[PDB]
Amino acid sequence: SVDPNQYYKIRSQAIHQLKVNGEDPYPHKFHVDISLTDFIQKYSHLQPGDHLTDITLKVAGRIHAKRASGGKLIFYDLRGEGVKLQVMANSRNYKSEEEFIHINNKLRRGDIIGVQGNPGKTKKGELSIIPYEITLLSPCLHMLPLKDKETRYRQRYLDLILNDFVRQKFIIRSKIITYIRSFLDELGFLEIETPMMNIIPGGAVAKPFITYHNELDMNLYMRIAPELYHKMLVVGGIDRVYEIGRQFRNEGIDLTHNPEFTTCEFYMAYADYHDLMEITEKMVSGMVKHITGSYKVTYHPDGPEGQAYDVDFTPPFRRINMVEELEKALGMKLPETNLFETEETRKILDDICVAKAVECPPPRTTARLLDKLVGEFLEVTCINPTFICDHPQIMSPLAKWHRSKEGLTERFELFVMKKEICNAYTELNDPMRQRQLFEEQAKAKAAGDDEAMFIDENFCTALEYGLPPTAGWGMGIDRVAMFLTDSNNIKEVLLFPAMKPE
Amino acid sequence: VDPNQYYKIRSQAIHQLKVNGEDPYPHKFHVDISLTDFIQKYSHLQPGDHLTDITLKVAGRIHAKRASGGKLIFYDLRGEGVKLQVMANSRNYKSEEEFIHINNKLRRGDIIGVQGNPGKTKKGELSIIPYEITLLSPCLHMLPHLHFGLKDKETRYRQRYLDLILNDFVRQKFIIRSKIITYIRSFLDELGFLEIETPMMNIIPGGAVAKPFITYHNELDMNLYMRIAPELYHKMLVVGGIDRVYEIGRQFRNEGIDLTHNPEFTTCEFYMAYADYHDLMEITEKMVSGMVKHITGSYKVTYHPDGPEGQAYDVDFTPPFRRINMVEELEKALGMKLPETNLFETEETRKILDDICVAKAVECPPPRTTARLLDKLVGEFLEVTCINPTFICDHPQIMSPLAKWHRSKEGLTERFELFVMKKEICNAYTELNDPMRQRQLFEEQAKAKAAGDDEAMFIDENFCTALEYGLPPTAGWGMGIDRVAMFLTDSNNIKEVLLFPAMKPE
Ligand SMILES: NCCCC[C@H](N)C(=O)NS(=O)(=O)OC[C@H]1O[C@@H](n2cnc3c(N)ncnc32)[C@H](O)[C@@H]1O
Ligand SMILES: NCCCC[C@H](N)C(=O)NS(=O)(=O)OC[C@H]1O[C@@H](n2cnc3c(N)ncnc32)[C@H](O)[C@@H]1O
């Protein structure tokens, strides 16, 4: 048995000699007549022993096995597109005996080859192609083995070659995105692109990446959300806009966070958050039914040997109000919602966290304590899709104030399998109120909150030209893909996930 | 009145409405019908008609406010790219007192809701005759006067929302942008391509010759580069056995702004196993000609290289596209023979090209590499003569370190660029898939980078290891979406087709 580095060195020398001899081991064009998939669909009815001499076809793929059965006969296990096809290299059937001997000497497991041959089926019932001629298209210079998660992510190409289920997760991911586009296109939304480099990042509470433009001699930030730009287009008269695109957040990596991820955001003039709850139910349950075939999905959050959950996407989804549900979950009344700005509320919330052992790193502000208490006591009860509604204004600096509950806003988040999938609200369109909330945010930054929003004057000026009553919405695409591919790790649904180095 | 005085006065008026509970920013106005549907449904009304039995709620932005005595006032209501006249009549309003109150309250630019009955003026103008108008969002700033409009480009580009409010041709350019992207997805989906997303933050940037943006990740404690192209990720997926992939997405290049460059821009890149670049010329001809025809109704498009006040040109997208070879057309344009193409990597050839650029007054800032000198000469002598869609083919290897060597012309590659209306649109080639020859070209590129070439590629060892597992013979393609939007909207400035283009600050 040879050694993988010794093998690489021998196979490199062999391919070099092919070059110096003029054997052209990286040819320019091979014309494929038919895919492997259609070859199987056309010919897998044949009878054992058959050999259709009147049909000549060219296929191509990757050798996954080379098994010899004699001096005149060699079997190649050809793979591609998710399927297999046996090449039955028989000397009698080949272009010549001299050329037959030579091509079989050349080929190894892993090479890309083109086969020109006839359909057939072995005595043992295996569908095959019987070649007149095989062409080496691209030799594989390394030894092919994949279970350990680290190698699959650093070398996704090996993962795709060896693990058929991986291609399917990314087909599902592609179907998610394509469904969303045609859902919103049908509603009249315009698909738009807005800057990913901003003088001032905003649209979310997140830590941004910073970079530098040499010619303009200015710092820029990668966007954390396109929200501010979308609301400026609504001011401009484009009543329905959406964007599926990459966001960037300088935050830690875990099972549901990657530093670059994909969201869909859309904005709808003359709608409120109640309208968006209906659209969300309709879109999300529709997507799940279209992709999986049912409203029910089985999710394994601790891998396959762990506990199974049945998540039920039948609309209408359950709704819970944040502050009232938290009171029921803690067993104690909280301050009146108009007192959430005060230091007494902050300390009251602080004490509750201490008593209930809910950790919260500094700064221990009212908004961050409430977040920690929600995740601990509410979010973990959201197995099926659940709307969590009416967030305190102090957590929602871009959301319009609630119609009848002072201190709250017209906001919702959708949770599925205890994880946040959507964030939405009636948009704050009062520019003076928006400017006050920015000033609060910039104070929360000066007082230790790495993720608090910057003041965006240019955005406040836009609101001064008149933003119609509007409602916007954001969905984390990667996370949806997780829950439709039974992946408990976001790295399963990212082709090349962010990794620590060597 | 002064524009700043107007802003101060209107802010104070609106603030007094809040303090008096007049709610100038109401939560919900339930619209019954869009303006577009209203226009279609009641365009069949006869002149002078006034439906007494149809009451509808619409909304929009007041574009103009014209009084006609104290009992009648017309509002020109805009939205969705269309216009609807509100014929506000005191006799039909909620009351004559409410009529005075709302007309004095409202100004040009306000967002209003309108509840009323369809009608048509004696002059034949489709109207709505309101029972009640509601302010939904006041416009606090004085809008550019209805006379001289909004024409100054600096203002349009910095306040794109203002541009959109006042210039309907702007909305049309971005509708055309959307259709371009949607057509490409349909074309490529139908051919079986899988739409993919590959990383925009890279340990090292690759896939192009460009200067990158650098950034930093705190938790992982490393520098990252914003991507200059997705190319290397795509070719690794073809090694992985996904024979057809594509991606329409942002690229980032830390280079100067001009009429055809923005620091961030959008490309479609696709890779197709078992194809070469001749196959991609046919595909490009079909996609692009079909795109123009489907979107504009014609294969002929009008082109003004010098603005609307100047010469108009008809540009024909009917395939086949003209095909020329780079080196020979360059030699033609110069009137002078360049060195044999197997000599394009020598220093003596770089010297000759440098001498020529000096002589022809083609500027090239340092580093004056063969590729950059060649790129400048092409831009000066060939790009300007590509009006109709044109394939420029068979670039020398030294400009194409990821492109496969030409199967019969030593020193050249199997590459083409599509040029339309004096602009580069596409870049494509048969993909280099010999990993030993790809490492060599990486090494030369690193040497140049040591000698201070901001744009030279890094040695990507992970990519080279990938090629050693076997990349099938493949062909790949990159198209500038912004650049297609330019030529399909007769725009000579890329800022016309980016919603928020990068600008130097105030
Ligand atoms: N005006 C309405 C608000 C719309 C969306 C708002 N601008 C916004 O960005 N909200 S968000 O909640 O911060 O992000 C949207 C979704 O992105 C997802 N998300 C957030 N951070 C990450 C990370 N880091 N990785 C993956 N997915 C993520 C998650 O599902 C969120 O619900
Ligand atoms: N293997 C095939 C190569 C495919 C494309 C290759 N990876 C690449 O990046 N080529 S490129 O020419 O550098 O860019 C592709 C297109 O992007 C467009 N482009 C390039 N720079 C800019 C800038 N700065 N702004 C706008 N558009 C731009 C232009 O249409 C180019 O043809």
Side-chain angles (χ1 to χ4, degrees), chain A residues 203 227 249 251 258 261 265 267 420 423 425 427 474 479:
Chain A
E227 165 156 343
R249 292 177 188 184
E251 53 193 31
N258 189 82
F261 57 99
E265 291 207 9
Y267 292 75
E420 184 195 330
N423 180 37
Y425 37 81
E427 307 288 332
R479 291 194 178 164

Side-chain angles (χ1 to χ4, degrees), chain A residues 355-368:
Chain A
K356 256 66 171 167
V358 171
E359 310 303 337
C360 179
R364 288 166 82 84
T365 58
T366 290
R368 282 170 42 75

Side-chain angles (χ1 to χ4, degrees), chain B residues 460-475:
Chain B
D460 185 331
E461 256 306 317
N462 295 339
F463 177 64
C464 287
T465 292
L467 287 186
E468 299 173 332
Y469 279 92
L471 169 66
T474 300

Side-chain angles (χ1 to χ4, degrees), chain B residues 207 231 253 255 261-262 265 269 424-425 427 429 431 476 480:
Chain B
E231 165 159 346
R253 298 183 183 181
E255 46 182 28
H261 295 80
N262 196 70
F265 61 98
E269 293 219 0
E424 197 221 320
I425 307 304
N427 180 42
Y429 38 84
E431 303 293 339

Side-chain angles (χ1 to χ4, degrees), chain A residues 64-66 68-71 73-83 85-91 93-96 99-122 125-128:
Chain A
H64 274 57
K66 174 178 183 179
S69 166
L73 176 87
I74 290 170
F75 297 104
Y76 294 99
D77 178 344
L78 198 62
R79 300 220 173 189
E81 307 157 7
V83 301
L85 178 68
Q86 172 178 287
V87 175
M88 178 190 247
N90 194 342
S91 180
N93 300 117
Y94 203 81
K95 185 183 186 297
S96 86
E99 288 166 292
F100 176 85
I101 294 172
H102 191 41
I103 191 63
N104 297 298
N105 286 323
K106 239 142 91 165
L107 299 179
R108 287 302 186 285
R109 168 168 165 264
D111 297 338
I112 314 294
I113 67 170
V115 187
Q116 176 183 353
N118 310 325
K121 182 163 282 175
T122 57
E126 201 76 39
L127 186 60
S128 299

Side-chain angles (χ1 to χ4, degrees), chain A residues 271-279 319 390 402-403 410 412 426:
Chain A
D272 73 5
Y273 73 143
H274 286 137
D275 302 317
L276 297 197
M277 301 192 195
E278 295 181 64
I279 292 162
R319 303 155 159 71
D390 295 357
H402 194 280
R403 243 166 268 208
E410 308 202 331
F412 73 78
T426 311

